[PDB]
Enzyme design. Structure first.
Site, PDB file in Angstrom:
ATOM      1  N   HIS A   1       0.792  -1.224   0.000  1.00 25.24           N
ATOM      2  CA  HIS A   1       0.000   0.000   0.000  1.00 25.24           C
ATOM      3  C   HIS A   1       0.827   1.279   0.000  1.00 25.24           C
ATOM      4  O   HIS A   1       1.456   1.634   1.007  1.00 25.24           O
ATOM      5  CB  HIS A   1      -1.007  -0.029   1.172  1.00 25.24           C
ATOM      6  CG  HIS A   1      -1.919   1.154   1.247  1.00 25.24           C
ATOM      7  ND1 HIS A   1      -1.468   2.369   1.718  1.00 25.24           N
ATOM      8  CD2 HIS A   1      -3.235   1.266   0.932  1.00 25.24           C
ATOM      9  CE1 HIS A   1      -2.499   3.194   1.634  1.00 25.24           C
ATOM     10  NE2 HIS A   1      -3.591   2.569   1.189  1.00 25.24           N
ATOM     11  N   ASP A   2       0.782   1.982  -1.158  1.00 22.67           N
ATOM     12  CA  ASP A   2       1.347   3.311  -1.423  1.00 22.67           C
ATOM     13  C   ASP A   2       2.772   3.504  -0.934  1.00 22.67           C
ATOM     14  O   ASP A   2       3.096   4.548  -0.352  1.00 22.67           O
ATOM     15  CB  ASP A   2       0.418   4.394  -0.836  1.00 22.67           C
ATOM     16  CG  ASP A   2      -1.005   4.407  -1.391  1.00 22.67           C
ATOM     17  OD1 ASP A   2      -1.302   3.598  -2.311  1.00 22.67           O
ATOM     18  OD2 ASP A   2      -1.821   5.211  -0.899  1.00 22.67           O
TER      19      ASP A   2
ATOM     20  N   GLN B   1      -0.449   6.359  -5.984  1.00 26.54           N
ATOM     21  CA  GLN B   1      -1.197   7.545  -6.373  1.00 26.54           C
ATOM     22  C   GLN B   1      -0.533   8.162  -7.612  1.00 26.54           C
ATOM     23  O   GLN B   1       0.700   8.196  -7.663  1.00 26.54           O
ATOM     24  CB  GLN B   1      -1.181   8.561  -5.237  1.00 26.54           C
ATOM     25  CG  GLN B   1      -2.188   8.259  -4.140  1.00 26.54           C
ATOM     26  CD  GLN B   1      -2.504   9.508  -3.357  1.00 26.54           C
ATOM     27  OE1 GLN B   1      -2.445  10.633  -3.869  1.00 26.54           O
ATOM     28  NE2 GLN B   1      -2.898   9.332  -2.111  1.00 26.54           N
TER      29      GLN B   1
ATOM     30  N   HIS C   1      -3.105   4.630  10.043  1.00 33.11           N
ATOM     31  CA  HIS C   1      -4.425   5.158  10.422  1.00 33.11           C
ATOM     32  C   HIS C   1      -5.233   5.753   9.276  1.00 33.11           C
ATOM     33  O   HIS C   1      -6.418   6.030   9.457  1.00 33.11           O
ATOM     34  CB  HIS C   1      -4.317   6.152  11.605  1.00 33.11           C
ATOM     35  CG  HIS C   1      -3.862   7.540  11.236  1.00 33.11           C
ATOM     36  ND1 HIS C   1      -2.554   7.797  10.900  1.00 33.11           N
ATOM     37  CD2 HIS C   1      -4.560   8.705  11.207  1.00 33.11           C
ATOM     38  CE1 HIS C   1      -2.493   9.099  10.652  1.00 33.11           C
ATOM     39  NE2 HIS C   1      -3.677   9.687  10.825  1.00 33.11           N
TER      40      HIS C   1
ATOM     41  N   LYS D   1      -4.056   4.378  -7.497  1.00 35.16           N
ATOM     42  CA  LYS D   1      -4.802   4.657  -6.257  1.00 35.16           C
ATOM     43  C   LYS D   1      -5.411   6.066  -6.304  1.00 35.16           C
ATOM     44  O   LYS D   1      -4.700   7.012  -6.636  1.00 35.16           O
ATOM     45  CB  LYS D   1      -3.797   4.547  -5.071  1.00 35.16           C
ATOM     46  CG  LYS D   1      -4.352   4.883  -3.690  1.00 35.16           C
ATOM     47  CD  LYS D   1      -5.144   3.732  -3.128  1.00 35.16           C
ATOM     48  CE  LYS D   1      -4.656   3.314  -1.768  1.00 35.16           C
ATOM     49  NZ  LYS D   1      -4.618   4.431  -0.778  1.00 35.16           N
TER      50      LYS D   1
END
Lengths: 209, 209
Positions: free
Chosen positions: B37-38, B80, B152, B121
């Site tokens: 993730h990213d 992204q 988070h 993304k």
């Protein structure tokens, strides 16, 4: 699987303690919808309803919906159905068990009016498996004012989904309740800093009247 | 609009401090997908990469992906894109500004292998505006093992969406990083009690080898 705990009573968060908003969005009566999130007998009965935060929650939800209806703001209620098909309930069973089998009615204090919309709820987020997103697009309304229970679960997930779906979520801090004052506060802190706006009942009334 | 802060160095959470899982799901190599993730230069540059938790995070992501590839587990990276159209970026701009304009590449330490999948993304959740859900259904894989940044924000939102979309999320506690040790821990505590499973790198390796 966990049971929803017998929720110990707690004080409604003082207005002065609400976290500061990072965004400066203003509730617009022409572009907003009020969501009354899962205010069913089943969910509210986990509290002693005669004790805070429940009487304040119900009176504040009434204050929000009455001023919304007077301003022509649609009011939408979500409610989980009884005896959910295990295949439809899916991963919720692993955490919470089979789910409600009765007490599906909206509590009488905040009972829906004839013109209000009522959707069958299936997940934490009010957008999953409901017509909420497409109906808001049809209505050309891109603001969701959220009231109800439980803050860190359904309210949080609905606000996150709204934000990611280009709908501005406004969580009414004194018109939600949770498993504890800490969960309630932590929901507001997360929303205000990462996913939406936190407003009071009076700020909502002031913006729409 | 907030800037991603200059993230101060913190120690990777001791394995003994990981919150206890409420669900008892086990990672199955036949049913799982690893999501990186990213892990882009842009997001990693906000930390001092020579200090904790970055060296251990990169080493740990590599332990996860190498074990995954050996077990035939697909590895998916999200990234992204630069210069996001304001209409596509929508409400993210109000919180975080216009977004990245460069440094879109996956950090070279964890650079994708030829067989790996790479998705563009658009939101906190890796499921929004991507083929992730439908591709996982096509592959008949219903478990998502999550590594990357930030706990988070994107990790949490991806875990909530997966859970609501009937995909079991497993957040690798020692293979994620966040804005602080508290945010990192609070992500794991929320996931373990409400939306998924929290596992260590060694537990992942043990389950898939």
């Amino acid at each position: 699987a966990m049971a929803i705990p017998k929720i110990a009573s707690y004080q409604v968060l003082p207005l002065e303690s609400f976290p500061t908003n990072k965004v400066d969005w203003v509730i617009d009566p022409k572009k907003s919808v009020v969501l009354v999130h899962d205010l069913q007998a089943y969910f509210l009965n986990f509290f002693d309803k005669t004790l805070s935060p429940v009487p304040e929650l119900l009176r504040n939800v009434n204050k929000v919906t009455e001023s919304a209806r007077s301003a022509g703001i649609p009011v939408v209620y979500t409610a989980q159905p009884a005896n959910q098909d295990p295949n439809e309930r899916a991963l919720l069973t692993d955490f919470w068990g089979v789910g409600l089998t009765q007490d599906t009615e909206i509590v009488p204090e905040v009972s829906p009016q004839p013109e209000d919309i009522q959707y069958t709820k299936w997940r934490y987020s009010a957008f999953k498996k409901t017509p909420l997103l497409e109906w808001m697009k049809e209505e050309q309304r891109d603001q969701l004012v959220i009231v109800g229970v439980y803050g860190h679960i359904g309210i949080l997930s609905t606000a996150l989904d709204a934000f990611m779906l280009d709908i501005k979520p406004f969580v009414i801090g004194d018109a939600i309740a949770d498993f504890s004052k800490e969960d309630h506060m932590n929901t507001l802190k997360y929303v205000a800093s990462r996913s939406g706006s936190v407003k009071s009942v009076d700020e909502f009334i002031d913006s729409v009247t």
